[PDB]
């Protein structure tokens, strides 16, 4: 009876209920020193939810890209790829520019209270751009599906789908039956993955409550004081990023942004809580399929953009760079923010397949200015920033996924 | 001609012939110092047989669980799971209790002849129960199928099968054809695996002869003397475990135990020789399919129980703990055997996915009593036990697999 | 327009054009000290081509061996296997014999100008033959497909194909539909892989130009002088190997060698440039499919022979061993070249699954003579050889692949 009442209750209402009571119970138990208790008792439910959403990432990206490449190969896919790459670079530049502006409006960093403490161990720089651009072609397709590797799986699935499309028009009548068997089996795998992510989103409110309860419990207390200016600057920059870039881009290309948010509420909240833009790829592809977009556009612009397009990470990089520059008391050489913008774009395009990309992206952005992370002062101020990393990480993951959904909708409306 | 005479000869007769001549030639060549010669020459045939049976473990557990979850999902699978978990915990408790009784009837351990020798390097304890209970959900399904991981493969196959069952009743007529293609391909993979394990069991007598020849050659000589009481206590406890637990449980639920043994002779002997309960999973699933049990019961209670239900290991843990307690000359505090029973059950339930589980299970069972494995005396007595590990390991693997077959038959007769 | 002119231009003409201008521009830029510039700028296109051809290696070897084992299992596959193993051992013996003769005709090694320099770190010897012969059966099929392992994939695909062939003749009518679904899906995967390798060979001239430009740029300058005798001896031995073994073997079994070369031009040139005999397996299987050979012969003798049959490596082993023997000024004990021939055959058969097999093959061939690689003089002379390793590696990979194509054609003409 009560289980039937819980299932038949709508999903977005209980997601909001879990979010609100998670924030309340998290701040209350963080205010009273019960951090280790909630960390050992409640956080495993959120870890289970994150692992349940990371389970479906690789089969859905393989299967509904093999069946997603049943579109016209020289006309559609090339134009969609070049348009979505141009879009991703443009919005990353706009996002880091707006982050620089939002950090220049506030004054984050006044007091000098830095002890040396624990410093960063010279964070290892990115591999050369040739090696990362050669990472896209896989040496083994099963070895690319076996551990991560979203970009080699994208490449292999695209090539297999184009080959199957060329295969099903052959003059033979056995090769046609073989290819129409393989395509139907892979399509069945994709539809099974969507039917699973329906039930995972049915489970989602418990994990949302647990995750944001732990986040607002451990790092919900350390946010008051000087770091509140950093949190306010990042969050105001992210909401102004949405309302002044994505709304303008949807009003230019003639789709209602309110109906767009009414659709993408699911993936936006799941990416806000889950704190991993690659771990909400099944929810993003589900909400793109329910938005009325053909497979050959969303199925390629979403898993590509979950690895390249990081807008909220770029805005946090700009705000963190300006906070490090104010902590040491530098003028920061007005006109050299073009180097910050350029390196924030080139770091996103040149750290595609590398795991742990955000840390070395922030490292090379700080290194291009003149504050390398081997200095003890910048390491102390960055360690002071890192205590509230999750509170900024939630919002920047939400904007990182909303960017992908907006770009997919723009390219699909254009084509 | 002679090859046709070898193939058309029945399988159980040549399995018994290979077993008997393997035991005879093993004791003879162990009595005469030809241990290294038989170890280098004859043991590779048994290693080839063990690898041939370990090849079929992961595809059959994936495929005939995806097609095995074509039963009613809320009614059948939940009741089968909770009943088989209750059964496994109950028989593990009964087995370690009977092991304590059988060690208390005998007097294993009289002489104190322990030098320090080579001692155990503080065997690393189990991971926390939250992490092992979170291991069940996989972060990657292909990464769970790629190296071991019977429990994440069980979880992913169950969820995929329930999704396909929900999928084949949809109102669409393309999704139905896609799902009925995928299910038929996976069913073809399962039937191909059973057709392979037929021929592997045809090969099996050479590997049985080689394996038990090496086992009775290297550790068939060190069994006489004081350790013969340990071997007799373990083997009498295992046969009394079978004849006084499984026979009573089959006579309660109304199936003939003699016909049950006449069926399960194949998997019992293969698990007796192969010395790996996970490596005789295809033979166990084949003999459960030939026993007339539907897929939704045997296909889930066998690979789950090949990782959790260890009855013979629990009985050997009880007997080894009592032997360590008699070797140091302790009273062993009558009434504290409840802690031995409780930790032998909780160690089985809390060391599910860990590889090398039996060593750290025995370690924590010895640690809960008051004889931790860092002491030199208990390390010397355990190193004296370890010389006859294979002779006990054969019988305890046989009882470990017969427990799974009995529990599957009980749940299938009930449902 | 120009892209249409590039695509519609024939493939072998632009492959020869890229080869010739690659050799010319490579020698010119190597003569002028522009080695690092061409290494950083042009070599990545060849690396991209090599990775594009290594992508298709594992799915095509799995898929068109599962569908390739739809032949009569006891009659065809056993005779084909034993005939191709006999062929591979015989031509490896002939190749190392002709290498010994060709090194004895020339006089490679006159001057003694060896400093100690950088020496080999006692190159680790091969695993025991039992362990390498047990490597053929996989402990995990998905773990064998996940990283390399051509031989366990061959074994698992053969067993799965024989099981499907036994399955499709069963009296059931659901198992037949399941097996005919699985076989058609795997056949669709194989045909998709061939349709991909068509386009990869369309891309191939850019990679051919880049690869041979870098090879003739870095190690095209160090070839003149004393090492030119080594290069001439190796290349004359390889062309005499082809024209006096493979032409005689095709004229004995009654097929025209000129039409055979007119077919196998594609795989011969791709193996000549790519410098990896396992990385031109899709081109070899494509040219064997276009040569009119049934699947059950080429599909098994090509991926097996890409791991065992190394004829050009055997000839280079003989010539390098004789060069090391002339560098130290030894008589080399006429009549002990039987040990060189025997160890060059047994090293090929006993280092099958090991990665990095050629180095330890040359190591054990040098060790069986009396010049172990721990001596400083032989390490200095081998380090002097290693400067022109690529120039010999191109031709010896070409002969290594032409051996497989010749043996497949002989067994297919016989059967
Ligand atoms: C607690 C630990 C739970 C660990 C596992 C949690 C979630 C695993 C979800 C796997 C999904 C199985 C795939 C089948 C599926 O998704 O079907 C879906 C079934 O939904 C479910 O199974 C949800 C079950 C999650 C239960 C979460 C915990 C319940 C606690 C109740 C407490 C109430 C107070 C429905 O799909 P549909 O398209 O809406 O069908 C329409 C009507 N037929
Ligand atoms: C020695 C080293 C051997 C290494 C490989 C050993 C075993 C690999 C087994 C692979 C099985 C191939 C799958 C096909 C299969 O299982 O079919 C099965 C064929 O059986 C076999 O192939 C058995 C062959 C094993 C030979 C073992 C060594 C023979 C030595 C003879 C010496 C006599 C003295 C029969 O299936 P069925 O359902 O009973 O069919 C009914 C009538 N058609
Ligand atoms: C530059 C970096 C390029 C990186 C990717 C390079 C190659 C990837 C090749 C993937 C193949 C896709 C599978 C589809 C396929 O193979 O179809 C094939 C399509 O062919 C292609 O796509 C070749 C495209 C390679 C372009 C190489 C670079 C072009 C540069 C032009 C410069 C001219 C001066 C044709 O197959 P068919 O059997 O002959 O069909 C008969 C008529 N329909």
Residue numbers in the entry:
A (entry chain C), B (entry chain A), C (entry chain B): 2 to 416
What do the study's own words say?
Sodium and aspartate symporter GltPh is an archaeal homolog of human glutamate transporters, which clear the neurotransmitter glutamate from the synaptic cleft following rounds of neurotransmission. Briefly, the transporters are homotrimers with each protomer consisting of a centrally located scaffold or trimerization domain and a peripheral transport domain that harbors the L-aspartate (L-asp) and three sodium (Na+) ions binding sites. The crucial conformational transition from the outward-facing state (OFS), in which L-asp binding site is near the extracellular solution, into the inward-facing state (IFS), from which the substrate is released into the cytoplasm, involves a rigid-body ‘elevator-like’ movement of the transport domain by ca 15 Å across the lipid membrane. Here, we report a series of Cryo-EM structures of GltPh reconstituted into nanodiscs in the IFS and OFS.
They block transport by binding to the outward-facing GltPh, GltTk, or EAATs and arresting HP2 in an open conformation. Interestingly, HP2 opening in the OFS, as seen in GltPhOFS-TBOA, and the IFS requires displacement of LipidOut. In the OFS, when HP2 closes over the binding site, LipidOut fills the space between the hairpin and the scaffold, and when HP2 opens, it displaces the lipid and interacts directly with the scaffold. The nanodisc is nearly flat in the GltPhOFS-TBOA structure, where the hydrophobic regions of the transport domain and the scaffold are aligned.
